[PDB]
Amino acid sequence: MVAFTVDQMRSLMDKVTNVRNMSVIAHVDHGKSTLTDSLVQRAGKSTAISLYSEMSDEDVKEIKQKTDGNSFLINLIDSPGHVDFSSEVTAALRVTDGALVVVDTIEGVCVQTETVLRQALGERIKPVVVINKVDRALLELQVSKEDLYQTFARTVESVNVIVSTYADEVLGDVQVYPARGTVAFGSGLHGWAFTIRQFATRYAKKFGVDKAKMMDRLWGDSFFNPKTKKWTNKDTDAEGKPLERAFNMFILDPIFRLFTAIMNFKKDEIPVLLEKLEIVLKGDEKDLEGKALLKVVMRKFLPAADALLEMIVLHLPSPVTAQAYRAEQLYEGPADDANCIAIKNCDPKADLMLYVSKMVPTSDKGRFYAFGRVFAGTVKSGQKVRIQGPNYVPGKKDDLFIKAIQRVVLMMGRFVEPIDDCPAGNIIGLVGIDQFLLKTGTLTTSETAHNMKVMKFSVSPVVQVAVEVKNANDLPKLVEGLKRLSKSDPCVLTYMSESGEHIVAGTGELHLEICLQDLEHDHAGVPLKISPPVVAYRETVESESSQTALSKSPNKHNRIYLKAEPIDEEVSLAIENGIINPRDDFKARARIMADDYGWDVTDARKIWCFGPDGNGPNLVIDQTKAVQYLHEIKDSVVAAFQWATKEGPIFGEEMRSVRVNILDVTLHADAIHRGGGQIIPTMRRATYAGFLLADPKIQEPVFLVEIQCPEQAVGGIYSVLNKKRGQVVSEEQRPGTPLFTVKAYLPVNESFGFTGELRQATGGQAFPQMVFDHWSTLGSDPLDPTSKAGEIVLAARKRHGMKEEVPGWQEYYDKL
Amino acid sequence: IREKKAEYFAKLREYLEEYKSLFVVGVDNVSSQQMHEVRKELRGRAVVLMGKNTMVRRAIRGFLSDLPDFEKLLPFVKGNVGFVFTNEPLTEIKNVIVSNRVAAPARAGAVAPEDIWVRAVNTGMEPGKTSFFQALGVPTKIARGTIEIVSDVKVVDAGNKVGQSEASLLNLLNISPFTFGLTVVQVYDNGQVFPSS
Amino acid sequence: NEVKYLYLRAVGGEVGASAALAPKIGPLGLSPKKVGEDIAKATKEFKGIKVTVQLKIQNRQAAASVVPSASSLVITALKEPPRDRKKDKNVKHSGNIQLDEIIEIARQMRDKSFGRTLASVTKEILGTAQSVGCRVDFKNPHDIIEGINAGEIEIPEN
RNA sequence: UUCAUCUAGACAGCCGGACGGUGGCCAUGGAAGUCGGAAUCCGCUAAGGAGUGUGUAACAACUCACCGGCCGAAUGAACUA
Ligand SMILES: CO[C@H]1[C@@H](O)[C@H](O)[C@H](OC[C@@]23C[C@@H]4[C@H](C)CC[C@H]4[C@@]4(C=O)C[C@@H]2C[C@H](C(C)C)[C@@]34C(=O)O)O[C@@H]1C
Ligand SMILES: Nc1nc2c(ncn2[C@@H]2O[C@H](COP(=O)(O)OP(=O)(O)O)[C@@H](O)[C@H]2O)c(=O)[nH]1
Ligand SMILES: [Mg+2]
Ligand SMILES: [Mg+2]
Structure with a gap:
């Protein structure tokens, strides 16, 4: 929206039944930002972007949500595909209600698609699937018409395996199907996509056939049987020469003929098809070759920006209906408190419930607007609000502050829009905090408002690197930089090791290298050097x-x-x-x-x-x-x-x-x-x-490590652990899911690069978390410099500047 | 070896002159567990003896000295065959031998004698088995938290052997399409041979 | 809810490990915990020994019962006075099992076994016991087996 | 040169079986022939190792020892120079 009106976004936002808070989740390079760009194409890190879509009576009535009106506002989050950023997608999932699953037709359902759906279905989010890069199968893999359909069926079946395994037994029917309109197909790069429900409307205007019955006939084993006009449900041998299905012959066929003619430069045949499909041209598109006429016709013939938002409006839930079954999941308190019930109602007049999840930078060092979702009540710019800390307990004194907000603001495409107030159940940021909330928390008004769940995420900081500046006098700039990085990126962890070493902790190598890059150039502004952290040992006796x-x-x-x-x-x-x-x-x-x-x-x-x-x-x-x-x-x-x-x-x-x-x-x-x-x-x-x-003897710290991995990749856990002296303790399986859980003792000494080794050995499907557990006594003598325990002592002494040998018992002992 | 070889001669000699009836059974594609089961059934009533086609022929050809009539056994001793010796109501002996048929699990490489199909059914297998169906291109849906095939698929076409992917899915669903059991080619008794029918 | 039939080997008188049965039973619906004590109820006599247990699961109800197996029955017949788990590696158990016990063991297996007479099954179990490492009648099980061969230790064919 | 197999059908080749007790004793987080130590059993047997390899987290599933179906006259191994 190009500055429609400041009030108009506020006024449309007032409606809590015509709003869609969704996040786009996909594999690393499955085209999610391109699809999101195509969704904002007609509107004139993950900052929320909002979309406006009108609607008509016929398709607004076909909506299984309590709603009234004909215009909808969509709240979109661009979630990252990388597993190293699998924490801010969890932040997005908490702040949103719907999930647009972008899936590759070429690569299918990949590892990160497996992960993000597990996160969405754990958080009780209804997913809708879009299969992108269909143009790649048309131009690169040369699938003719039936291979493309079969790939779609494999893709849908694969998604539903994820859904059926990980959907909680409170909804059940959250399975994804193209027939119901929950699966879309298109090419986001060229800006075209469709749903069979949309296509069933296109033929109804000319054939007059019912649209409710075209759903189960345009997909699956369903054949038109031409020359007879009888919609058979099986091949029947077609009395010879078996015929194609409706999906190929009615949906995919018009697409492929356009592709074949336009790519093969049939200048006499392109206008013939175009005039049949009632398309619109321009003053310079007539003089156009292939790979550019195809893009313009496909965006005009089947607009991705039009199919997709209608896809959101129909099936993705509104806030008023998901908080019904989700309120008990975000609220650790009892189910029978007024604050819990106010969450379910999503009524904008009860006590305030605003869960802050992000600190959005301001181009100014240290202002960091507080991004979050309003759950209950209406927030006003300049009202006393009780801030709660992550470990806040209402019984006693805890991290509760009694400050107030300066300005309530709307997120958009890197611009901030101040509004006086905002109803419940939408996306809102606050100005005047980040001096009162380290990472997350809630903003309330009641005296009996417990803070909601801590927003658990599937990843943890497992990569440890020590950091310290080459310039000794530049120490405070680094620690200022460390504290600024700790609050900008929500998953980075900065602390001090037991050997007086600054430690930056990240999810993986790529995420850690991103944060360390921020330290060197953006946050600290001082050049620092990175080393493996020094392991702190203990000294004991065995006699x-x-x-x-x-x-x-x-x-x-x-x-x-x-x-x-x-x-x-x-x-x-x-x-x-x-x-x-x-x-x-x-x-x-x-x-x-x-x-x-x-x-x-x-x-x-x-x-x-x-x-x-x-x-x-x-x-x-x-x-x-x-x-x-x-x-x-x-x-x-x-x-x-x-x-x-x-x-x-x-x-x-x-x-x-x-x-x-x-x-x-x-x-x-x-x-x-x-x-x-x-x-x-x-x-x-x-x-x-x-x-x-x-x-x-010397004692080394030992990590207690627990990894969730699917059955196919459990072998990598043991291979890496048995190479890094890991000691497997116990195994378990989650009910219904194939996810293994391995508990093992991985020594901290052989624990640097373990997660990188683990991810490669398990194909990225393993998710390890580590915490210091105990100290294990090494059996070898630490005074033998050639022993496995005597090389640590010799190495440590050189680093400290001490001598190489250890002063023997002859010193410290007087002969008597 | 010869002393071991001659011992089988003695066993065959003893059976030939102590059991008026003997059953020539074709044991093609018959497993060893199936053979054990048949011997258990026939235990007491009868005794099953297998051997090398050439070995028995020489044994029979030599035994003709005392027992000439046995010549007629020889010409039908070819292929994978065995001898069930009995002095019992042959019909019951015949029924037990040919009724112990056990459905052999589908195996990769076995030429398919008909058109194997995977019909639309509730397989009852948990959703982590869709890869097997997806491997064969079988359209499936997850109804009631289990794999439900949507449409008939001909997993193996007649003639073409069962592929490894074909067999793996089939053994999961227990769609073994070929059954084997001891078939009878000849019946000898009262110094006369004749077919089982 | 059906004829579903599982066969797990568990140390007797103790609930099975979570990783041993919980993945398999529970996809049907039955919570592992009360199934776990079900084996304990079956295995009381066989406590301290990894015995097979059949599971006839039907209507959220697992029929837990010890499946007679050569190694299990032979050792539990000797009753294996309390075996210290922390004693040492290669836990040894030989004792002295009587001929009466082993032929009685063979009867419990004679149904499933593929022997002709009882003598076949009895020598079979003796072969099993040798692997277990027992001492039948102060003698190696093989020696008793060959004794059965040359008409020394007869077997009641009943 | 020596020792073997062989018309009582040898070697190669193609095809069938390769079981039951039993998940043998164990420790091992898990080890069911196949990480390992010790033990190399018995039944059914034409024949099958408490298992020669692939494989599994472990099962599973393939494969080979062993025996068969075909063929029909020779063949194999280790050495010597
Ligand atoms: C969220 O992450 C948490 C823990 O979960 C994690 O275990 C990590 O471990 C750090 C160490 C903690 C150990 C104990 C305090 C005693 C010795 C300490 C270590 C070694 O020196 C072992 C681990 C690894 C760190 C050295 C090698 C730098 C430790 C440290 O902080 O010094 O600590 C952070 C704060
Ligand atoms: N052919 C084709 N390529 C695509 C499509 N969507 C994305 N891409 C490719 O993906 C690259 C960047 O995709 P992007 O949207 O940034 O991936 P993201 O990380 O999921 O957001 C581009 O270079 C495109 O070539 C599509 O629909 N068709
Ligand atoms: Mg991107
Ligand atoms: Mg193993």
């Missing part, structure tokens, strides 16, 4: 400190005897989730530690500190007998344990599951000789000595 560790103070008046213990993992897991907490009281925390974990009760009471940081998974035990001045050096001992458990003695990493049993202490009588300067160094060296005799 009992074969001989006692002995260390002397610098003054030699103090000696520490201790030993190391390989603390059980279950006790170690207990500490870090709060079961064994230092701030608990001794002799009670000891009882839980002793009775419920198999430890000795006496050791359980005699706790000095946890390491590192005072609450870590490492322990120091007072195994000493009666001794004079332990209590005055207790503070120094725990400080050294904090030092020793923060920087281990192998390559300087945190200790884990290490217990220090202090067998004996010999201290000088005078406090000035057993001060911190004498005990802190000697305990750390004794701990370092004790660690190095109890078979030191």
